[PDB]
Amino acid sequence: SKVVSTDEYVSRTSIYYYAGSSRLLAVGHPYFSIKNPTKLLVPKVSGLQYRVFRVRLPDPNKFGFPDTSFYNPDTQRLVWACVGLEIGRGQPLGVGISGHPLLNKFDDTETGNKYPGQPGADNRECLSMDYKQTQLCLLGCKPPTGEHWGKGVANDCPPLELINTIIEDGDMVDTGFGCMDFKTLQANKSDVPIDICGSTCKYPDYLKMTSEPYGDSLFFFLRREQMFVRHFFNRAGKLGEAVPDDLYIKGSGTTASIQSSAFFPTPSGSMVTSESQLFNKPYWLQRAQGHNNGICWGNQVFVTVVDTTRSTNMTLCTQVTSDSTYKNENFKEYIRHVEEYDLQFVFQLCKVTLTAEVMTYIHAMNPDILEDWQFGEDPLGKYTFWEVDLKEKFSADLDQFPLGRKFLLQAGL
Amino acid sequence: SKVVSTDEYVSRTSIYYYAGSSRLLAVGHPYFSIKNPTNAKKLLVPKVSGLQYRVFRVRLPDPNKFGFPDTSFYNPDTQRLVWACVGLEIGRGQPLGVGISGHPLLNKFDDTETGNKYPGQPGADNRECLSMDYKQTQLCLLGCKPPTGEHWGKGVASTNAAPANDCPPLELINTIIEDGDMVDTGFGCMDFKTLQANKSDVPIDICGSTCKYPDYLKMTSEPYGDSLFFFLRREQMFVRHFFNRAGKLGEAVPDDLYIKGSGTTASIQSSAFFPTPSGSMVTSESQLFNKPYWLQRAQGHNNGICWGNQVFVTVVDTTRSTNMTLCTQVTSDSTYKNENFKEYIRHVEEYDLQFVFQLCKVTLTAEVMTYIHAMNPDILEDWQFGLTEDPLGKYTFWEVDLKEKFSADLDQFPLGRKFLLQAGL
Amino acid sequence: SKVVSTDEYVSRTSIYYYAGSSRLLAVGHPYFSIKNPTNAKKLLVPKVSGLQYRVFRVRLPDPNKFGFPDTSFYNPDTQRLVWACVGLEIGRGQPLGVGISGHPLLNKFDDTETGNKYPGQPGADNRECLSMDYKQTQLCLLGCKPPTGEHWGKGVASANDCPPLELINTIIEDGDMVDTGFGCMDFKTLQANKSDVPIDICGSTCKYPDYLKMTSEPYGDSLFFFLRREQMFVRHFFNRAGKLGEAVPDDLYIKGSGTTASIQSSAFFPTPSGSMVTSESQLFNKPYWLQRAQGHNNGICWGNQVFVTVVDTTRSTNMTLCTQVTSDSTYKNENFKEYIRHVEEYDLQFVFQLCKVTLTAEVMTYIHAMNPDILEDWQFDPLGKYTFWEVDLKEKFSADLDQFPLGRKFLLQAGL
Amino acid sequence: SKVVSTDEYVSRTSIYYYAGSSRLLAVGHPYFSIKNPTKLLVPKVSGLQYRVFRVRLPDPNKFGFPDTSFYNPDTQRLVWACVGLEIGRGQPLGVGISGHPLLNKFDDTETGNKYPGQPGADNRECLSMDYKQTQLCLLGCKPPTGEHWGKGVASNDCPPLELINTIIEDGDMVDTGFGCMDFKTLQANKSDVPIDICGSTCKYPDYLKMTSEPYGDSLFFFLRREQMFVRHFFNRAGKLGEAVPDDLYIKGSGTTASIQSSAFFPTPSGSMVTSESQLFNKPYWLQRAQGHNNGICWGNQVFVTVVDTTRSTNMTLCTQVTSDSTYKNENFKEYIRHVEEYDLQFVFQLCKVTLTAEVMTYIHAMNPDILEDWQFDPLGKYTFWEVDLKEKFSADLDQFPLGRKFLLQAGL
């Protein structure tokens, strides 16, 4: 049908509630997960992962309100609207490093590699790098949609297909090598560092999400990406598509067999700073750009976050044997990464008058809304999200919490 | 039980006072303290580093025992007095500059920025002498309660059944930030002494220390808001170099992430990478200090009330971390000989705390006493003198005594003059 | 007594005057002065460096003896006149640029940025020829009192050989070295080997303005106002040769053996770098209008003199000069002599406002407490031991403001 | 005399005119000009040169106006006033490189040069660098005045330095990071700076002298933006003319017996060029000048001085001498060329001057040639880029980009 703003059929009340997730912690390995010598022994926790929080809200129609005289349950139903959001972030600012002990890096081509080139059977090197810096935040009542390139269906070069998937908690953000399925498009498992070489890097499909009719994916969003090229390398292996003859004059002797033009850069996120921080500050959802003005259908909200500005990897070191002199054989080296979150919300209570035209519109939009309201199995159960249960976390005492105090000043309340 | 703003039970007066700490100096060694090879537990050269927290415990005179010229502004039978902080400037001397830390035996193996070709040759001891500049940090915290920090330490492991791996379990620990504690430097906020056994993975000024980061989340969400009247912070860093560690790799790369090598690439190289930080450049424009802050409305419920007649000023300033090179001549000669000179390193810190305080009165009604007792009973204990030791003594602070430093002549001091223009008086 | 603003006992008139120093030039060697080899304790080539303080002592004509066209605007029986500074522009010539300092025999041992592998090779003399660009600094101070600086010197000797450090306040003189990235310390007395910092500071003292002390002095005669802009970052990471005076404690490392048996020097030191000079960050060649000072002296130039203190390293370019001793058809190093010279170009511009002071009994008591020399020169030089760049403006005052650049700007600013 | 603003004796009319030079192109070699084995074959065209345009205006007293009833030629004379200016710049942004195949560079002293030093007879190297970035714009009816350091009069072999003021001519070299000096006379070895300045003089605008001149004819207004940093640290070969004093260092021995050269010098770098930092391709409206001449173009001429290193890209050209199936270096010749594209746009306002006895006395004191040309070429020794606009004035302002902008600015 013709989509209308929620402001036309969802009534706002003066009832507000605060809800906080409290400290959220993830501790794990930044490059790979550790399996049980049989489930996960040590999870993969990286600053380059998507954090997709599925925040569960209490059903307002079954909520224990002190006074339920503000609406008529015979003809009306209740729904929460998000009006304030602050994403707390702990831990200091810092930059981590990823790498590969056997990266397919051949020669440094920044100042030039003189002829002749010597390509043996295995010239992989141990190289590491810092990734492209990314901060982003998405808010909606529907999980976010990402885009990435995978191997499609049919030189033998793989066909490229742009694939849309739901971004799950733990998915890898793009790091400077693009949003692609590195497992299926890079067979040697050695062209990108190990924390993505068997993974898929996804980029938010902002274009698709903003153009969807009802606007359930993006109540609003913020994003800040930056990177530059730090080093200039080339690949080892057969060059799949040779340079055409009309683009160069053939060499002779030392320059007879041409060198590999399969170049690749290493990225660098440059500096992280406090002023460029997107987080630890409130966002007030006054007017969404989509038609859904922050209405949390189904009593759930999705907060999607990427934050590489706190990607420091901690070095842990144990001593196996105590000796009076230093021996490398006496110590084991470990790496660990942590993430500290604290989600804060301010919700506004809303009522929906269920006329025949309103029920028809809602049924077109989403039939499950009317069934859950008991009027006219989780399809998202196949996906992985960070569940945040706030059913027992709602409070009407706004000024007893930081974001609630800010909301009272913002709305002048 | 329901926390309310101090604006509801603390009455403001038109009485203002200035107080200044005058020059505060700390001179010492930036990497370690030097102990006395003799009694008694005293220090020859203290550890003074630009990477340290400065936690000042500012003692204020008890206004209930203060010699006021006219005490007709309140009723001591039913009321009590307390100071409220309304103005603060953190003076900083010495020029801007950046210091450097390092380790003569740092566990640095290979440079992996442009790649390290195979094979790698790891002998018994490949430690090198390397140094670096740290992440730049400016921050300042103000409250009537000492600040709370967070860092990672060694926890306890579940040993049932058998050991999963010898990697130490990590636990997030909250402690009070004491004067002299090390700020995070780019290697995280952790207990390096207990989590890095080889004493050689980070420079020596933190390798036997704990780096702490302020638990801003915990401090702002605590109900009464006595820790943070306000705060300012400015952090920046980038990755300068890319290295890897020597020693046994505790957790090997799984097989599905690479195709095994052969010959030169048979023994995989260490993927225990680590960066060196860099705070980039310090500039005058980004300075947090040497400017006044006016505390008009705090975000917490404590609107600058200095309970217990004390204030905590927490400062980190790495923008003046210059380490001075000192050089003595042992033997006089006409030609240069390396053994005729001794090389020393010293670091200095120059502070000057300035405040403007507002006198306040509290009426001890039945409702006020019930509330204050819930919040903090020690407030009512210090007030009570008849009817009808140090809880923080176990911690180390830079004591700043202002009991004899309060002055009512505001226009006679720099911050007092600024306050008069700001408030229009 | 209790200090009050000059606004309470100094009356302003509508009489304004312009004064300009015209072009001021200093030409010399940036690293050291060249003294006379025979028959003289005078200098052939002065030390002129972009890292020096310029402290101008500006002499103003006594307004009480000034040849005014009509002197009926005040009563000489009960009043006295004094100049107040209301406008200032510090003109700077020469293009923006960065100079370089160094030391042919600097105590640099190894580069410790990517690591120095063991073992270390400490011979008898490993000093190297090294150069660097300094921390960038712009600052400007204005007062009727010479500026006060701070630096670290050798203290009172009072269980090791490390010198005790003492914070010293001195008057900043014209030609003193500003801090360059190694701190404000007496390098001649605190670094005996003369080889830890470049030669243009290794036998000098670097001073930093004691802003805290100057702003806290009661009358506020030192800083009518000030501007400052400093920046630097660490460019390189080195360590020192020589005996390590204070060894690393044993609990901070596990001892090595064989190649790593003899521990390396942890006496690290950085080289600074001022990054870029830009037009946007220039403090100079723009006017400053002194409407209300933060101190109690609101720009009143007691003693008919003003001190202008400037540091500007954004024009520290050192020119390379090359002479040909023998003309030859091919290039030979033995035919040329290499010289280095540095120049500084200033142009001080002022707008002064004439003021009168009514000498009542209460005012005379206050002024006498503040400064007794003020009332005696009125009828109603301990600074000779210091070195300043004397700027004589006694014959440079003009009331025709619109005939000069700063004067035209002032007329537009105040709407006159 | 006593100088007064032109607003006091020059009356403004509501008559405005547009004038544009159209495309201005210069193509040449960025390091040196090429002369014939007999004129000029290839001029020296570099992004480090001053462009000084001498703009000729039509004499308004002899201009063909449609209606001349707005003034009395018996008692008045006409003059143009500049009220709008835009300096059009074509070609993309980019940075060029200068160098010297035989530069007097000895050792790299950035991380240290270990002893002993090996100073042979000729240790010059082939080195190149990017220069200090400079954007500047000057406007007046008098050519600009520059400053540079030259050899003074001798009164101990260091040359005496003297500060010299000259008129900046089109083609003069701006300072590049080595100062504003006469490199031909102050650097005898011809190898201390790159070849495009080593036999030239780098000049810097004498802003102080021009702003302090009484009538203010050189600078109606100006804009400037300079930036640079030190990229590398070197030292010079040759005899050290002035040795380090003995009290500043402890004598060496053995390998460190013979001290190394402390004749250090930096290489500059202009860092990055950006669209945001552009001074050009935007209009400047001359509403009130800081000098007393408020944009009055005495003598029917205007001088526009421009420096722009943000388009200093040098193009590499390569010809093929012999066709062969494999690559051989001797079969190709390598050339270097640089280009500059300008487009000067002006908006002029017609003004009338009533020549009373007081006004004529003032004008004659200021400049006697003004009244003589009014009937009521001293600069032939200098080189300028001549811009003839005598046949380029148009009263149809809304037909041109700058003219449309002016109509919006003044609300006309």
Numbering used by the authors:
A (entry chain B): 19 to 56, 60 to 175, 183 to 404, 437 to 473
B (entry chain E): 19 to 406, 437 to 473
C (entry chain D): 19 to 176, 182 to 403, 438 to 473
D (entry chain C): 19 to 56, 60 to 176, 183 to 403, 438 to 473
The authors write:
HPVs are non-enveloped, double-stranded DNA viruses comprising multiple copies of the major (L1) and minor (L2) capsid proteins. The native T = 7 HPV virion can be mimicked by an empty icosahedral shell, called a virus-like particle (VLP) which consists of 72 L1-only pentamers. High-level neutralizing antibodies elicited by L1 VLPs can block HPV infection; however, protection against HPV infection is type-restricted, and there tends to be little cross-reactivity among HPV types. Each L1 monomer folds into a canonical, eight-stranded β-barrel (BIDG-CHEF), with the strands joined via flexible surface loops (BC, DE, EF, FG, HI).
To ascertain whether structural divergence drives HPV type specificity, we scrutinized the crystal structures of L1 pentamers of genetically close or distant HPV types. First, L1 proteins of HPV33 and HPV52 were cloned and expressed in E.coli, purified, digested by trypsin, and crystalized. The crystal structures of HPV33 and HPV52 pentamers were determined to resolutions of 2.9Å and 2.75Å, respectively, with refinement to Rwork/Rfree values of 21.0/24.0% and 18.7/23.5%, respectively. Both structures show a hollow lumen in the central axis, and two neighboring monomers intertwined by surface loops. It should be noted that the surface loops in the non-crystallographic symmetry (NCS)-related monomers within the asymmetric unit of HPV33, HPV52, and HPV58 might differ slightly in conformation due to their intrinsic flexibilities. Then, five L1 pentamer structures representing two groups (group 1: HPV58, -33 and -52; group 6: HPV18 and -59) were aligned to compare the structural differences among their five surface loops. We also observe that the surface loops of types within group 1 or group 6 have quite similar main-chain traces, with minor differences noted among the loops between the two groups. To test our hypothesis, we genetically swapped the loop sequences on five surface regions (BC/DE/EF/FG/HI) between the two most phylogenetically related HPV types—HPV33 and HPV58—and generated 10 chimeric L1 constructs: H33-58BC, H33-58DE, H33-58EF, H33-58FG, H33-58HI, H58-33BC, H58-33DE, H58-33EF, H58-33FG and H58-33HI. Notably, five of the nine HPV33-specific mAbs (C2C3, C14A2, C16D7, 9A3 and 7A3) failed to bind to the BC loop-swapped mutant of HPV33 (H33-58BC), suggesting that the BC loop of HPV33 may involve a major neutralization epitope. Analysis of the extracted cryoEM map of one 5-coordinated HPV33 pentamer and one 4E5 Fab revealed that the 4E5 Fab is bound to the outer rim of the HPV33 capsomer at an angle of ~58° to the pentamer surface.
